[PDB]
């Protein structure tokens, strides 16, 4: 049926997690090393835009203590 | 940027009674309300120069459509500038 838009096996082999929502802790740790910082868009194969917005939403999240800012907090 | 209801008030009072935005008197009156709000902001915020560039744009297109209007009808022109309380 028409306008299905991500039924199956289309856009990406690897799934996109969030954009600008920032309220779940487990979705954000998808892009955080143990050194405590956001991963480049070449490694994940995000299109750059979706990453520039996430970069703000994760930083916003970090500053609210959902996430570690530094390796020293492991 | 202007409020929806300010944009409808300009259209009611200026141009013809068709309530278009397209015409030379009403484009001059729609620019005008935005120049006047920006000169409100710029009562303070005195280091904000790269946006002040935007005032000199809004002003300059208004100088071009009042230049056009005065090559045409003197009634529309002399009525507008005093009815719209414009310049000094």
């Amino acid at each position: 049926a028409r306008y299905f838009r991500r039924r199956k096996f289309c856009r990406f082999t690897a799934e996109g997690v969030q954009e600008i929502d920032y309220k779940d802790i487990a979705t954000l740790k998808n892009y955080i090393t143990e050194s405590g910082k956001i991963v480049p868009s070449r490694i994940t194969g995000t299109r750059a835009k979706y990453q520039r917005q996430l970069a703000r939403a994760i930083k916003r999240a970090r500053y609210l203590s959902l996430l570690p800012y530094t390796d020293r907090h492991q | 940027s202007l409020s929806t209801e300010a944009t409808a008030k300009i259209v009611s009072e200026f141009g013809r009674d068709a309530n278009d935005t397209g015409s030379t008197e009403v484009q001059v009156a729609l620019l005008t309300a935005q120049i006047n709000h920006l000169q409100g902001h710029f009562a303070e915020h005195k280091k904000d120069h790269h946006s002040r560039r935007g005032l000199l744009r809004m002003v300059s297109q208004r100088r071009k459509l009042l230049d056009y209007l005065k090559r045409k009808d003197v009634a529309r022109y002399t009525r507008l500038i005093e009815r719209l309380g414009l310049r000094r």
Binding site: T33, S35, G36, K37, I38, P40, R42, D71 | -
Partner: protein, 70 residues
């Protein structure tokens, strides 16, 4: 720069490949070196720049089939 991300199965030799994702690069690499403001945008961000030698190689593969070197 043994890098804080833990190596799959711990051993005396750190698995430096499996560890880094964006650590040390640009931040702790230019140690005892002069800091520039805007040069890093074109100086360090060289991911397109390094792909070209791989592309050149992937092009010459095809030509070796057409020449009968392959």
């Amino acid at each position: 720069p043994v890098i804080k991300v833990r190596e799959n199965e711990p051993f005396d030799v750190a698995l430096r490949r499996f560890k880094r994702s964006c650590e040390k690069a640009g931040v702790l690499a230019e140690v005892r070196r002069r800091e520039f403001y805007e040069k890093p945008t074109t100086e360090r961000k060289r991911a397109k720049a390094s792909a070209v030698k791989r592309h050149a190689k992937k092009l010459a593969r095809e030509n070796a089939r057409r020449t009968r070197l392959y």
